[PDB]
């Protein structure tokens, strides 16, 4: 998204009671919907808007510049199978390679 709204990402990633606040707002807790809003309806719409950062927005779509690759079915068919970049998996592999190549134990 934008490079200026990203502050609210830490507003969804703090550890106040000891857990991440997105999983706190995915449940209808007693401390939830009162700690951020005095009114009930404002709390409901703020919870819905704050939890909508996980759900995909817009129609399901892949652009023309994206990759789409036909796959032959066993009996008489194809699936179009647009791949997406696994940035979480790439970040995990890059973190593991960082520990492997520039970690303190690895350097020792």
């Amino acid at each position: 998204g934008n490079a200026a709204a990203l502050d609210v990402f830490k507003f969804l990633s703090l550890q106040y009671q000891g857990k991440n606040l997105l999983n706190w707002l995915t449940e209808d807790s007693a401390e939830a919907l009162q700690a951020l809003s005095d009114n009930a309806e404002q709390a409901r719409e703020w919870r819905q808007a704050f939890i909508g950062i996980t759900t995909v927005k817009g129609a399901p779509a892949s652009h023309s510049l994206a990759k789409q690759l036909y796959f032959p079915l066993p009996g008489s068919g194809y699936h179009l199978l647009a791949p997406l970049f696994p940035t979480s998996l790439v970040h995990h592999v890059h973190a593991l390679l960082r520990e492997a190549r520039f970690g303190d134990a690895a350097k020792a």
């Binding site: 399901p60 036909y70 179009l80 998996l89």
Partner: protein, 306 residues
Amino acid sequence: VTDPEALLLLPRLSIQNANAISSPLTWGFPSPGAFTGFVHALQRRVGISLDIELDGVGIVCHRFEAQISQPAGKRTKVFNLTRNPLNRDGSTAAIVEEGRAHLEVSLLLGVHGDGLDDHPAQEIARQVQEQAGAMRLAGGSILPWCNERFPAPNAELLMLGGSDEQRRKNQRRLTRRLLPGFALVSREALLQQHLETLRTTLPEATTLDALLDLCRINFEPPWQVRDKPGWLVPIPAGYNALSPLYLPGEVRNARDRETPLRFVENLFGLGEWLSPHRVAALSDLLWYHHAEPDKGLYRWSTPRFV
């Protein structure tokens, strides 16, 4: 999924600028899915008219050159790029780092169908060769060998041998043809048993860590290197489901509005490069599709290997 009645040897094919980035995690030799898709495109274009089916591809990879460079002061490498054309305002466009590789591979194709009895073997071999000489294999143009010394036609060898010794001699001659290369095979069993070995070594270890351990050079203190059974490359092993299979007209800006689209994630497995004389039969090296479309899992593998 079936035993081939014949094996067609497409010879040394010089692919000019193949996609060196095989996967979001791996670079180098292209995906085996590219080779299986090329063989299915060959069957789609010229296979149906010859009344034959083309399923299963064995890759030999006689030569590989990567359009890469090593910058000074770093042990890693970078991809040499192409200058894209300027925008409409005369400025340089945003660069997408795409790597290229010059390949020289020869392909074993599994042929089954009644058309093998309807045409001469050299006729269907020459037809699929002249069809493949105007196609692409991993994003690169195929150099069709003009004005050199001695061009190489195919050699379609029928796998229904009259005798076991004649079949053995045919397979050894076909292996002798594709000699300066390495068969790339799938190693799901080896990767799974190495995952079990690491899980006995240390619990809650994922298949990603077992795949990584089979590629890095492990240094063990007394300082020796932990050995590997083979080359043990990390290959893209297929595509797993990331979304439900939407309707053909449902997905906006799809390639065609008649094929259903499903968003996928890359599947990573362990592949091995072997000298092709270390196989029982050359039909074991064939890379087959395996969809299983109810659960995603759009894989390519080498069934009937060992």
